[PDB]
Structure 1
Amino acid sequence: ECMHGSGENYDGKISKTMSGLECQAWDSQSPHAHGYIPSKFPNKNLKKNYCRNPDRDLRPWCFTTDPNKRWEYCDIPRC
């Protein structure tokens, strides 16, 4: 429930962005169409709408439920 470096391993349950937006569940395309399908990267834990770092990005992220904000970085507690 806190992370390492980049969070390539975070499997925590935080589901909001650094600005408070509830994340969009990875297995939905609403409000945002995207290709981070879980069936596709099954080993990356694109579990519910939990923040995740599947792409060697700088820190966990997710897609926003706000239609105007495609995606944001999350704020995960560094351990």
Structure 2
Amino acid sequence: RCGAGEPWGNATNLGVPCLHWDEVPPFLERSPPASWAELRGQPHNFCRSPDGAGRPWCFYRNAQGKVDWGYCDCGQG
């Protein structure tokens, strides 16, 4: 039950949980496609959509200690 454009919430697409936007390390492993400082979900974690294509995505933190970003479509990655 995953339509494109609809985020899973706190999981990059359908995999790794979204870390908090203010908890994103200044030295990041992935480069973000857009300036997300205005996603303004800093206090919390939840997919955001900087892309005018209606494509939500968040930063996921995995058990490797990594924090990267992924599209939240639950089937578009």
| Larger relative contact order (Cα-Cα within 8 Å, sequence gap ≥ 6) | 2
May I ask how many residue pairs the two structures share in their alignment? 64
Q: Give 1 or 2: higher strand fraction.
A: 2
1:15 corresponds in structure 2 to 10
- CA RMSD in angstroms comes to 3.5
Which sections of structure 1, spanning at least 5 residues, go unmatched? Answer: none
Which sections of structure 2, spanning at least 5 residues, go unmatched? Answer: none
Q: Deviations over 1:5-42 (max 9, x none)?
A: 857xxxx88111223211121112239637623xxx2x
Alignment of 1:1-79 (within 5 A): 6=5, 14-30=9-25, 33=28, 36-37=36-37, 41=38, 44-46=39-41, 48-57=44-53, 59-66=55-62, 67=66, 70-75=68-73
Query: What is the percentage of aligned positions where both structures have the same residue?
Result: 33
> Normalising by structure 2, what TM-score?
0.54
